[PDB]
Structure 1
Amino acid sequence: TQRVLPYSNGLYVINKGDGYIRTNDKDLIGTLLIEAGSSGSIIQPRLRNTTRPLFTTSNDTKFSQQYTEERLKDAFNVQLFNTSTSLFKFVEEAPSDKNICIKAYNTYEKYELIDYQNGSIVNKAEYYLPSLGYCEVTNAPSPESEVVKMQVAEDGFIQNGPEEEIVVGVIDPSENIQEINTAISDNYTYNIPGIVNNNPFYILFTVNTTGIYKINAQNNLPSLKIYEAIGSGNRNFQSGNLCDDDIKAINYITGFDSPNAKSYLVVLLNKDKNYYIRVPQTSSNIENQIQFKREEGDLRNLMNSSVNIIDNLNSTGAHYYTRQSPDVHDYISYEFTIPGNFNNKDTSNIRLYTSYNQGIGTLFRVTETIDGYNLINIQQNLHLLNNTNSIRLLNGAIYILKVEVTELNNYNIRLHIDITN
């Protein structure tokens, strides 16, 4: 009964805590026996740069030491692997009554590089970065007590620091990055170059005016994913242009990994931030373009989510759509048309629910006006998990269901649209 990890397909770096030490006193600096009333200090004067990191991997060819170090440098911007100048010193003063023993251990910080692909880890590497020690004080043992003979323990690690799990996505270094050298004001068409040649890649860009934006490839094909460069726009900034910070640390906002997806992104973009757009391997030579449009009307009601375009809803019966489930308090949208001819009068009884993940849904009636789309909120507080309630909808009309995930029980969400009449 493991927990579900709602990460998009990509490379992630996980800080799993500090204070790790090897077993069988492999990292033992030493022990000081401090007499009553005395003091004892163990010092790392850092007179030598040399620190020794540890590394194990499941796949050497792709997740090598150089690759893992570069990914660590990408995520947390670490750059001292084999050296360190940081001083630490452990001082303990025994009480006036009895003596004291202090043991000093060299510690490590545990980083885990993972290749997460569709709900499971396909490649995992552990990098232990030399930390700043661990000091434990004990009562001076009675000199005999009993010398008990014990077998050694297995090679491993013991964490004496606090619990920690910090996840940061990293740009895949094998995929190209194109640059939109100019900020996007209200509308922009980015022609996908023939240089990349239908290979998955990233598009780095910035926005002129903070606001909501609709992003889509042509015919909403293929599906895109949008990332925010973590910590971007803090330092250097040119108004109306792009300041490439070379930040490889990315935060997944939204997007589907399946490239055969009809979907378009509605996302809040800040003028003072850099954003990446990962578009996957397209199977066609046909020309494709990326469309940015600053949404002023009711598409703003869809932030931030990838809206699914539904086309196979042409018959009456049971229809279910399986997509990668967003995290809790995140959104996923479905745009769907009720089958049948639209004459304002014909109605069909619709039942909307999900299989395993509970969420709150909101229905919008979509009327394409002359100023874009218009969304009329007609249904709120929709508990979709095994929902048995039904609502009658006009035949031939367009609707958009926005689902906010509240309980995360499965890597995928299956939206069932059952239609009667």
Structure 2
Amino acid sequence: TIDLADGNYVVSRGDGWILSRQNQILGGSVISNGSTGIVGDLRVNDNAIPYYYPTPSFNEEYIKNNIQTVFANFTEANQIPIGFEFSKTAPSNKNLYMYLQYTYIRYEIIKVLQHEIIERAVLYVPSLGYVKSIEFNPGEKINKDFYFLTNDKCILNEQFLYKKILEQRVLPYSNGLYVINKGDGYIRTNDKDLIGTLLIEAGSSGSIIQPRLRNTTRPLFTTSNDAKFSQQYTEERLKDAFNVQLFNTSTSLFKFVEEAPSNKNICIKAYNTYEKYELIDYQNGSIVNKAEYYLPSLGYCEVTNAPEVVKTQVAEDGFIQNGPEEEIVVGVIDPSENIQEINTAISDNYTYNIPGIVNNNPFYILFTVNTTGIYKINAQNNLPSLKIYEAIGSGNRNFQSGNLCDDDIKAINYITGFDSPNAKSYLVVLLNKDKNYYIRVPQTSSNIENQIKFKREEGDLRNLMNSSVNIIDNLNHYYTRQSPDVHDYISYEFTIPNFNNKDTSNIRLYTSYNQGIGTLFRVTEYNLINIQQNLNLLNSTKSIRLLNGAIYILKVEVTELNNYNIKLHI
């Protein structure tokens, strides 16, 4: 009496099955005259023994292996103790007797031939309990059906899940590692993470407890390139960003309690949950390596009102999110790149000679200032271009005036800079006292001794707060660079082509894809005087008359982002 085609099938009939001749095994409780009774149980290693009923075709191992591949791995789930409790209140001037029994999950394996099941193997997996109550006056005779069950029954809800046994977003992130928290509440499909179901009768209350009697827990890992993103590697980067210490253990308890009304019974289903972390490697506007790590969480609870067969096929393997939408992006230091430290706080002017130990390879310079202010950071001949990051939560705990306190923090936040190493530019950024900062020097090639120059620019240049000025020289025009995120500013400095304060020419400035409002300043050689304001660049046709031979700086924000790169015309 089956519709499926000839062949083998694995079937899950759902939780909430009670065996026969097992009703009053655990005993009962008696309340009276409004007394309140609570009966609970724990399932750890002895009341968690699965019951097999195989056939000559399907042995115990065959039944076990197939089911655990598609449904919850009961072998590793029965190892973790789980508790369940029930509560009933007797009415006034009456007595109440309530007895408890276990509930099992019924997994079948069948062989269909000519639209008729010709074989069946049945496995009962201990899941949770169930309480049956009755108000009895003394001396009354009860029906035997209440005490004795002579046939297995489905009480939670009829279910039938069958399996045949086959033989575009714009992300303006700079190049580097990132760890993204995609949210909590993830659960695997096909009830592969179901702690269990529990049926609370009318007027009663029920509860499911993870008492954490055992620290053991099961994370999950899925990489795209195990060469770089290993399991031990991803877990190390998580500790860098979010300071996650416990992966395979846990000491947090979670309970789920439901107090059903006096009209209808209710079903409460408890699943284990995971928090999803994504470790990516962003490069030139494209992910090249991604690893998903699912860390165990504190469960999820679903309440359903109990209500034919509705044969259904198992859902495709995957995850489902039940928690709120979340996306937290945190940069991380690449462990491969070395980390040089500057021990002396920068006061007003510093010259840094890049050590030879770097061996012409990219690395990080860790530094901090001796006094808050706006600083200009550049390099000899303004090449190569630099990137600057700010450590998250630095200079909050340990402070030593003058010297540097290396917090060893690796959760960095991008500020500004260009990943292109062939361009020439410098940075003007607002740095704060007692805050660790990183500068990522890229892979230089020339053996010529490079130098990093810091200056405390207290003049008109402060108008360029947190801006990567790019020296667009050689003008005599389509210059493209990495587009800053929304509300971030990028500046271009250029000298107009026999300066005599009289010769002048028309210049056209417009942005191909991204619209932004920018201002143009005229250099004094030092002092900047505004020459415009609120100059939209969304393919504007406006032209500005400027004297030849005068150095100007045009700073543009990012009003709206629609392309990874930013292109300027001159």
Query: What TM-score does the superposition give when structure 1 sets the normalisation length?
Result: 0.95
Per-residue displacement from partner, 1:298-329 (whole Å, max 9, x unpaired)? 11011111000112212xxxx11100000111
- SS of the counterpart of 2:239? helix
Higher relative contact order (CA 8 A, sep 6+): 1
| Counterpart-to-counterpart distance in 1, 2:530 and 2:330 | 36
Please state if 1:243 is matched with 2:405. Answer: yes
> Residue 3 of structure 1: CA displacement?
2.2
Per-residue displacement from partner, 1:71-107 (whole Å, max 9, x unpaired)? 1111111011100000000000110001010000000
- SS of the counterpart of 1:374? coil
Q: Which residue of 2 aligns with 1:344?
A: 501
> Residue 182 of structure 1: CA displacement?
0.8
Q: Which residue of 2 aligns with 1:415?
A: 568
> Residue 277 of structure 1: CA displacement?
0.3
Per-residue displacement from partner, 1:154-185 (whole Å, max 9, x unpaired)? 11000000000000000001000000001000
> Residue 197 of structure 1: CA displacement?
1.4
| Counterpart-to-counterpart distance in 1, 2:342 and 2:499 | 42
Q: Which runs of 5+ in 2 are unaligned?
A: 1-167
| Counterpart-to-counterpart distance in 2, 1:356 and 1:241 | 46
Alpha carbons 1:56, 1:127 under 8 Å: kept: yes
Per-residue displacement from partner, 1:341-372 (whole Å, max 9, x unpaired)? 1111110110111100000110000011xxxx
> Residue 280 of structure 1: CA displacement?
0.3
| Counterpart-to-counterpart distance in 1, 2:278 and 2:545 | 50
Per-residue displacement from partner, 1:35-92 (whole Å, max 9, x unpaired)? 1011111000001110100010111010111111011111111011100000000000
Q: 2:367 aligns with which of 193, 205, 221?
A: 205
> Residue 147 of structure 1: CA displacement?
1.6
Q: Which residue of 2 aligns with 1:85?
A: 251
> Residue 288 of structure 1: CA displacement?
0.5
| Counterpart-to-counterpart distance in 2, 1:260 and 1:367 | 28
Please give the residue correspondences for 1:148-167 in structure 2 after superposition, counting only pairs within 5 Å. Answer: 148-167=310-329
- SS of the counterpart of 1:69? helix
- SS of the counterpart of 1:103? strand
Structure 1 stretches of 4+ moved >4 Å: none
- SS of the counterpart of 1:405? coil
- SS of the counterpart of 1:242? coil
- SS of the counterpart of 1:73? helix
State which structure, 1 or 2, has the greater radius of gyration over its C-alpha atoms.
Answer: 2
- SS of the counterpart of 1:77? coil
| Counterpart-to-counterpart distance in 2, 1:21 and 1:47 | 22
| Counterpart-to-counterpart distance in 1, 2:539 and 2:473 | 24
Please state if 1:15 is matched with 2:181. Answer: yes
- SS of the counterpart of 1:284? coil
- SS of the counterpart of 2:494? strand
- SS of the counterpart of 2:542? coil
> Residue 198 of structure 1: CA displacement?
1.2
Q: Which residue of 2 aligns with 1:299?
A: 461
| Counterpart-to-counterpart distance in 1, 2:206 and 2:309 | 26
Q: Which residue of 2 aligns with 1:354?
A: 511
Per-residue displacement from partner, 1:355-403 (whole Å, max 9, x unpaired)? 00000110000011xxxx1111111001011010101111111000001
- SS of the counterpart of 1:406? coil
- SS of the counterpart of 1:335? strand
Q: Which residue of 2 aligns with 1:6?
A: 172
> Residue 20 of structure 1: CA displacement?
0.2
Percent identity of equivalent pairs: 98
Q: 2:215 aligns with which of 42, 49, 55?
A: 49
Alpha carbons 1:214, 1:267 under 8 Å: kept: yes
Q: 1:388 aligns with which of 541, 550, 570?
A: 541
| Counterpart-to-counterpart distance in 2, 1:58 and 1:348 | 55
- SS of the counterpart of 2:183? coil
Alpha carbons 1:106, 1:132 under 8 Å: kept: yes
- SS of the counterpart of 2:528? strand
- SS of the counterpart of 1:385? coil
Per-residue displacement from partner, 1:195-251 (whole Å, max 9, x unpaired)? 111100100001001000000111110000000000001101101111111111000
Q: Which runs of 5+ in 1 are unaligned?
A: 141-145, 417-421
- SS of the counterpart of 2:357? coil
Alpha carbons 1:206, 1:241 under 8 Å: kept: no
| Counterpart-to-counterpart distance in 2, 1:357 and 1:283 | 33
| Counterpart-to-counterpart distance in 2, 1:134 and 1:167 | 25
| Counterpart-to-counterpart distance in 2, 1:147 and 1:270 | 67
> Residue 272 of structure 1: CA displacement?
2.0
Query: What TM-score does the superposition give when structure 2 sets the normalisation length?
Result: 0.70
> Residue 274 of structure 1: CA displacement?
0.6
| Counterpart-to-counterpart distance in 2, 1:127 and 1:243 | 32
Q: Which residue of 2 aligns with 1:110?
A: 276
Alpha carbons 1:357, 1:408 under 8 Å: kept: yes
- SS of the counterpart of 1:6? coil
